[PDB]
């Protein structure tokens, strides 16, 4: 796994073209996330 | 050591988690190629993931980050979709859950948009879709996402397309 840029603990990907996109994030240490909820679902076919 | 507790749909905690799921669906630039065509989900179940060891491992690292960033963990709740969700909930996140080819290098990626994480549930780019029908837009098969507590600390800001 790579490393955080020096002096940082994560990377934020800020959307710069798709005005409706929200942010995406990367961590480089597994201990920096806890899988708190398991959500089971189906996508729904639009009408 | 992991146990799954089911939340009742009547519980405010089920309801706030469902709302985050539903309200952060968006349209994607692939017109639904990777994750399918949908505006909303049918939530079938929401379970709380409980594991003392993985939790303590998370809070230990959280305190370290916090102490290197003026007592600010910069903690978020973010989605994660992965073929490896069963390994994750039992064994924790590790380098086997990393996206080697991701835009910001080899790490573990999370999304504010549930629909973005949905694109990775059957693999990178949606893989070959659901196991049963080979359909990236399957409306039948059950999918799973994780809603995760994530420590960002000082985050390097990448402006990007
Ligand atoms: O939830 C995600 C899972 C994954 C993922 C990638 C490779 C293997 C397993 C999961 O990639 C993402 C990329 C961007 C993003 F915003 C979210 C994700
Ligand atoms: Zn299917």
CATH, residue A44: 6.20.320.10
Class of domain B1-161: alpha beta
Contact B51, B1 (CB under 8 A): yes
Give the one of B40, B48, B103 whose C-beta lies nearest to A13's C-beta: B103
Query: Which atom of ligand 1 is nearest the CA belonging to B110?
Result: 17
Can you tell me whether residue B81 is helix, strand or coil? coil
Beta strand ranges found along B70-142 (DSSP E): 75-80, 108-111
Domain count, chain A: 1
Residue B151 — φ and ψ, nearest 5°?
A: -90, 120
Tell me, using a 6 A CB cutoff, whether residue B145 lines ligand 1: no
Can you tell me whether residue A22 is helix, strand or coil? coil
CA B66/CA B58 separation, integer angstroms: 12
Cross-chain Cβ contact A1/B98 below 8 Å: yes
From chain B, pick out residues whose CB is under 8 angstroms from the CB of A32: 58, 61-62, 65, 150-153
From ligand 2's centre to the CA of A42, what distance in Å?
10
From ligand 2's centre to the CA of B152, what distance in Å?
35
CA B147/CA B158 separation, integer angstroms: 23
User: For chain B, what's the residue count?
Assistant: 161
Sheet holding B75-80, edge to edge: B3-6, B41-50, A33-43, B143-151, B75-80, B108-111, A24-27, A10-15, B155-160
Element (H, E) at B88: helix B85-91
Contact A33, B51 (CB under 8 A): no
Task: Name the nearest CA neighbour of B110 among B128, B90, B88, B131.
Answer: B88
Task: Name the nearest CA neighbour of B97 among B114, B113, B80.
Answer: B80
Contact B121, B143 (CB under 8 A): yes
| HSE-up (13 A, CA, CB side) for residue B131 | 4
Contact B100, B124 (CB under 8 A): no
Q: Provide the pairing of β-strand B155-160 with A10-15.
A: parallel
Where are the domains positioned within chain B?
Answer: 1-161
Element (H, E) at B4: strand B3-6
DSSP for residue B29? T
Question: A34 forms bridges with which residues in the sheet?
Answer: B149
Tell me, using a 6 A CB cutoff, whether residue B124 lines ligand 1: yes
Domain that holds residue A27: 1-47
Q: Which residues contact B35 (CB under 8 A, 6 or more apart)?
A: A43, B28, B115, B118, B119, B121, B126, B136, B137
Can you tell me whether residue B155 is helix, strand or coil? strand
Tell me, using a 6 A CB cutoff, whether residue B93 lines ligand 1: no
Can you tell me whether residue B145 is helix, strand or coil? strand
Residue A35 — φ and ψ, nearest 5°?
A: -80, 85
């Amino acid at each position: 796994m790579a490393h955080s840029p020096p002096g940082h603990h994560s990377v934020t990907g800020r959307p710069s073209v798709n005005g409706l996109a929200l942010a995406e994030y990367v961590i480089y240490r597994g201990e920096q996330a806890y899988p708190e909820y398991l959500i089971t679902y189906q996508i729904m076919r639009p009408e | 050591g992991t146990i799954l507790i089911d939340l009742s749909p009547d519980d405010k905690e089920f309801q706030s988690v469902e709302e985050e799921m539903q309200s952060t669906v968006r349209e994607h630039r692939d017109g639904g190629h990777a994750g399918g065509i949908f505006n909303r989900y049918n939530i079938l179940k929401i379970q709380k993931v409980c594991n003392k060891k993985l939790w303590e491992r998370y809070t230990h690292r959280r305190k370290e980050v916090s102490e290197e960033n003026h007592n600010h963990a910069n903690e978020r709740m973010l989605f994660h979709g992965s073929p490896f969700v069963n390994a994750i909930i039992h064994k924790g996140f590790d380098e086997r859950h990393a996206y080697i080819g991701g835009m910001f290098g080899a790490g573990i990626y999370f999304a504010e948009n549930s629909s973005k994480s949905n694109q990775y549930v059957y693999g990178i780019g949606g893989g070959t879709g659901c196991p049963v029908h080979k359909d990236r837009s399957c409306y039948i098969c059950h999918r799973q996402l994780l809603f995760c507590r994530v420590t960002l600390g000082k985050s390097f800001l990448q402006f990007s397309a």
